[PDB]
């Protein structure tokens, strides 16, 4: 076992000696280290001044580095410090995690408009201060019109986007790499030989496992096409392409030939659906072939590498992707490394509620779907807006109840498939700032439809009290009263134009005029 150095907050400990050490690295995970410390040889008392000074320097949020020669085994921040006392015996345990742990802190909501997944992901890492690279992942260049994170931390949001875009996360100690899972078959290969010479890889204990309880034969993704009013073209995925020979996840025979079908209620273009379908299939088929191999300790192993078994026979020969590497240091066994194959199964964090919203100033819809820009206080606090579809009591081709809400109205916001990216308006409500023209009353006599916008007022009024239905635009009005007359009042002229006019009265017709009655025509025949 080579020299192990442990630097906490830049310096090495003087009172505590490392008894144990275990470092874990995994794909789509936050690497962690566990260190057990203690005072050796009764050099100092545990409650002495020097020992307590080191105790206060090992508090959480301190920086911890584990290094062999120049190679950096681990770099991170202490998250947990534990003390063990039993009689005269004492022991300290430290747990530190990768700087990716900082993505798990916080709980907020924000909106991304006209940004690609690469831009959003790079922004999240920059806030935590993490360098990142992207390899063989062109699918992250697609631009989302509106991407919403709702009441979750950056880690949960990132994990949802990784699956939806079919990408894996390799947590390097200095650089975090995002790569398509199928692109990892071309990585470096560490080969284990059954018939071996004296300089090959020594295998101590091994594990292998083939399962089919969660292996779908096909995955179908279908989406609702708003423009065509039809379900989009179905996309089928039949393979994962991970591994080769007997360690390939595709070599496992499925239970049944059935299909796993998703039919979303929101639009989704063909390219994004294909990546989502592939990400779903890889998620379920990742753990078809799994196992663990324990070898002599070495720092050249990294997650994402290819592990090949050669010469072990027709039942084990193949290749697989190393999804995790663990380093174990102890006095009894020295330095040992464990390699892991497979991964346990895990699109957008969901809304569940009904939300209020404010209709914004008019903006043209980019997709020409007639959506209305609204501001949702919960989903965001910035000046950017969201586009939501409008629900109407009646709507058909070239007809319907078309009363578009004015800017500033309060509306009820619902979401399609509980997705924050697809809001819909279910109705407008009245508030102490937009007074309702009619207040609720004991008798509820009057119903109406007013369009008052200052001094201008146009309405259609149903009144149960006097049993009238009226149309009025300002002072001009037209009233129909049951068991009474039809009254037509105007504050100005009254013009009636028609081809023929037939005014008939069962009792009498009494025309009038205060300054003249001019009866024109070409043949005035009285009788």
């Amino acid at each position: 076992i080579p020299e192990i150095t442990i630097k906490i907050s830049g310096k090495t400990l003087n009172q505590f000696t490392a008894i144990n050490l275990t470092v874990n690295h995994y794909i789509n995970g936050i690497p962690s280290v566990n260190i057990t410390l203690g005072i050796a040889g009764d050099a100092n008392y545990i409650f002495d001044a020097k020992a307590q000074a080191e105790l206060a320097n090992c508090r959480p949020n301190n920086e911890l580095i584990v290094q062999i020669q120049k190679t950096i085994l681990f770099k991170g921040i202490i998250v947990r410090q534990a003390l063990k006392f039993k009689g005269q015996d004492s022991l300290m345990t430290l747990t530190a995690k990768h700087p990716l742990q900082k993505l798990t802190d916080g709980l907020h909501s924000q909106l991304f408009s006209k940004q690609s997944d690469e831009a959003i992901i790079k922004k999240l890492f920059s806030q935590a201060g993490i360098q990142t690279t992207i390899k063989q992942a062109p699918q992250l260049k697609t631009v989302h019109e509106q991407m919403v994170q709702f009441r979750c931390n950056d880690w949960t949001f990132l994990k949802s986007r990784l699956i939806a875009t079919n990408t894996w996360l390799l947590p390097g100690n200095e650089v975090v790499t995002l790569i398509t899972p199928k692109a990892l078959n071309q990585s470096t290969v560490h080969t284990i030989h059954q018939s071996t010479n004296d300089q090959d890889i020594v295998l101590f204990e091994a594990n292998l496992q083939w399962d089919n309880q969660r292996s779908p034969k096909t995955v179908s993704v279908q989406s609702w096409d708003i423009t065509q009013q039809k379900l989009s073209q179905t996309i089928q995925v039949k393979n994962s392409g991970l591994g080769s020979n007997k360690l390939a996840v595709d070599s496992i025979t499925t239970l049944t030939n059935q299909d796993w079908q998703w039919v979303f209620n929101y639009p989704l273009d063909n390219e994004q659906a294909k990546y989502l379908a592939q990400g779903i299939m890889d998620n379920l088929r990742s753990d078809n072939v799994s196992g663990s191999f324990e070898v002599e300790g070495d720092s050249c192993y990294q997650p994402g590498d290819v592990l090949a078994l050669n010469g072990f026979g027709q039942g084990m020969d193949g290749q697989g992707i190393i999804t995790g590497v663990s380093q174990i240091i102890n006095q009894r066994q020295g330095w040992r490394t464990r390699l892991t194959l497979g991964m346990p199964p895990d699109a957008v964090p969901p809304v569940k509620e009904l939300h209020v919203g404010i209709v914004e100033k008019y903006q043209p819809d980019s997709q020409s779907l007639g959506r209305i820009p609204v501001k949702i206080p919960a989903l965001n606090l910035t000046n950017s807006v969201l586009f939501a579809r409008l629900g109407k009591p009646y709507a058909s081709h070239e007809s319907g109840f078309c009363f578009y809400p004015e800017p500033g109205d309060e509306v009820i916001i619902g979401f399609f498939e509980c997705d924050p990216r697809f809001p819909v308006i279910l109705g407008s409500m009245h508030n102490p700032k937009n007074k309702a023209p009619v207040e609720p009353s004991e008798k509820n006599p009057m119903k109406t439809l007013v369009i008052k916008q200052g001094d201008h007022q146009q309405a259609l009024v149903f009144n149960n009290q006097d049993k009238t239905v009226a149309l009025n635009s300002g002072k001009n009005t037209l009233s129909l009263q049951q068991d009474k007359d039809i009254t037509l009042n105007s504050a100005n002229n009254l013009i009636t134009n028609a081809q023929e006019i037939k005014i008939q009265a069962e009792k009498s017709l009494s025309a009038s005029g205060k300054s003249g009655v001019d009866i024109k025509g070409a043949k005035i025949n009285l009788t």
Binding site: D89, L91, P344
Partner: peptide, 28 residues
């Protein structure tokens, strides 16, 4: 397997294997 340092080793090994089986059964 008597003092604190070794008891941490043995119990952690049992914890890791117990946790893996329980998690598999719960997800099953």
């Amino acid at each position: 397997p008597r003092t604190l340092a070794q008891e941490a080793l043995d119990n952690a090994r049992l914890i890791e294997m117990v946790k893996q089986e329980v998690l598999d059964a719960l997800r099953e």
